[PDB]
């Protein structure tokens, strides 16, 4: 019974299940390693059923929920062992939430039919303010300022949070107990986005100081700092490869970083309302890029503040395809509020026709790894599902989910079932205010809660 | 922590070896000894330490690399 024989037993037992489940076996084994080849291999968009989606909204006591991170155990083909931390956690799905109330909360979402169930939480406060006032001494266990982001380790052993307190605290998943605090050691280094490398302990942190920081959670140490962004790095995404992508907000540049090569690729939208009109013979120029998600190791998507969702390919610096005003136009300001004059016509003139109208922003944008479908979010009141073309040159609107009402700060998706039949659950954090701050006016009907939608797959 | 990266890897069966350029990131540290780098390169390449050779290490101005 040498270790090699054990792998043979597990491999033989694994193969028997595939035979029981089912040419088909040969294709299935190839799909197991399709992740290593960084190409899209999950064509299920047409087989999705949005219309029959079971939508539900779960209110949460926390005010203005800021982000959501979900953990899914995955069977490792190399060792045939689940990624669950312990045997108790076998096939248990966890989702972690952060808010500006300085509270971290975990929920169990294993039961697709049932709503998220709270298990444990940890809350911060003024107790955790550092006395030293030095950056390197900002090693307090709990948070003392707004929490902006959360990420769950792929191994299911740790969950990490970061915010404007300029700290990276990593918590134990089971008890939400802080085990290490990693100060950024920068005056303006507020954490804005966190992304775990898929099936790895490497973490990429985007900070307000115009830098990206890399960490090793198993080792609890900082590794490298990346430079090149001219403005705040608002969002970051990563896949199995080390090729993380980021967006610089007002600088209007999307950046792909090759960590091994120590090189960077610069992408710029370069669209002008002026030219879009003559080719037509309302177009809003992009102001900032706020969201990004990597559809593929060789493709990614971005969302701007002008309501433009753009598809990108590494070969081309310019966008390959764009979807202008994806989420529609904001409601026109009321004429009884624009001006104080008695005559109604005078007030209408202040509206200046349609020229004051502005588009919705893409607050959230998430793509399932190596798939042809991605989800976009805003405060329009609906989550839109898009399907990408087979040639990866364009995408179309697959459908919408109107259950969500409020600001979609972050979107996550989890799957369960057999390799043939899967049910997808879309979990989106909903808040009454934008994650970065309180700019946006209050949205009528907005509530703070976790939006859930279970989509069954048939064809 | 310390990171070791290898680039420009050329297989040289004429001398029966592999040639490469080694970049060492050592924040908050002076620099890394040749024996230590040989050990880690041996671990990465799955070869004896005796079969690993390292040289020509210059720390860049400002330190850390």
């Amino acid at each position: 019974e040498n270790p090699a024989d054990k792998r043979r037993r597990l491999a033989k037992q694994y193969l028997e299940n595939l035979k029981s489940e089912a040419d088909i076996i040969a294709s299935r084994l190839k799909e197991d390693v399709a992740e290593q080849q960084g190409r899209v291999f999950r064509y299920f968009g047409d087989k999705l059923l949005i219309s029959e989606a079971k939508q539900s909204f779960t209110r949460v006591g926390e005010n203005n929920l800021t982000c959501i991170s979900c953990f899914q155990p995955v069977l490792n083909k190399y060792t045939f062992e689940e990624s669950s931390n312990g045997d108790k956690n076998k096939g248990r799905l966890f989702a972690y939430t952060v808010s500006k109330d300085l509270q971290l909360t975990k929920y169990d979402i294993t039961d697709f039919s049932k709503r998220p169930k709270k298990l444990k939480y940890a809350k911060g406060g003024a107790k955790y303010i550092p006395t030293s006032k030095h950056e390197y001494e900002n090693t307090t266990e709990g948070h003392y300022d707004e929490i902006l982001t959360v990420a769950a380790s792929p191994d299911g052993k740790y969950v990490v949070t970061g915010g404007r307190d300029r700290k990276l605290i990593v918590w134990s998943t089971e008890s939400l107990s802080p085990v290490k605090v990693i100060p950024t050691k920068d005056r303006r280094g507020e954490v804005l986005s966190l992304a775990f490398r898929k099936n790895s302990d490497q973490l990429y942190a985007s900070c307000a100081d115009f830098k990206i920081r890399t960490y090793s959670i198993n080792q609890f140490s900082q590794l490298e700092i990346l430079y090149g962004h001219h403005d705040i790095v608002e969002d970051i995404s990563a896949l199995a490869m080390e090729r993380c992508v980021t967006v610089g907000a007002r600088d209007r540049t999307a950046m792909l970083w090759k960590i091994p090569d120590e090189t960077r690729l610069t992408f710029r939208g370069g669209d002008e309302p002026q030219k879009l009109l003559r080719r037509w013979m309302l177009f809003f120029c992009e102001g900032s890029i706020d969201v990004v998600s990597m559809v593929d190791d060789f493709h990614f998507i971005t969302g701007s503040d002008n309501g433009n969702i753009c598809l990108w390919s590494l070969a081309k610096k310019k966008p390959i395809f764009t979807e202008r005003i994806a989420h529609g136009i904001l409601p026109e300001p009321s004429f009884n509020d624009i001006s104080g004059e008695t005559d109604e016509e005078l007030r209408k003139r202040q509206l200046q026709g349609k020229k004051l109208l502005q588009p919705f922003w893409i607050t959230s944008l998430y793509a399932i790894p190596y798939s042809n479908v991605f989800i976009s979010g805003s405060w329009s009141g609906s989550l839109k599902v898009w399907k990408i073309s087979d040639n990866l040159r364009s995408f179309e609107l697959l459908g919408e989910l109107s259950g969500a009402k409020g600001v979609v700060t972050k979107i996550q998706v989890v799957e369960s079932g057999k390799h043939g039949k899967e049910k997808f659950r879309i979990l989106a954090s909903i808040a009454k205010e934008h994650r970065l701050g309180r700019w946006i006016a209050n949205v009528s009907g907005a509530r703070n809660g976790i939006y859930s939608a279970v989509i069954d797959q048939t064809g | 922590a310390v990171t070791i990266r290898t680039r420009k890897v050329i297989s040289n069966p004429l001398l029966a070896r592999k040639q490469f350029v080694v970049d060492v990131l050592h924040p908050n540290r002076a620099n890394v000894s040749k024996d230590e780098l040989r050990e880690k390169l041996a671990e990465v390449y799955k070869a004896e330490k005796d079969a690993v050779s390292v040289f020509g290490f210059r720390t860049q101005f400002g330190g850390g690399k």
């Binding site: 140490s221 091994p260 | 990465v44």
Partner: peptide, 19 residues
């Protein structure tokens, strides 16, 4: 006659972190 087809690099960078 056509020139020999280019051969991809056999070796690629490998990475490790410690202490």
């Amino acid at each position: 006659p056509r020139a020999a087809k280019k051969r991809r690099p056999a070796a690629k960078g490998k990475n490790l972190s410690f202490k």
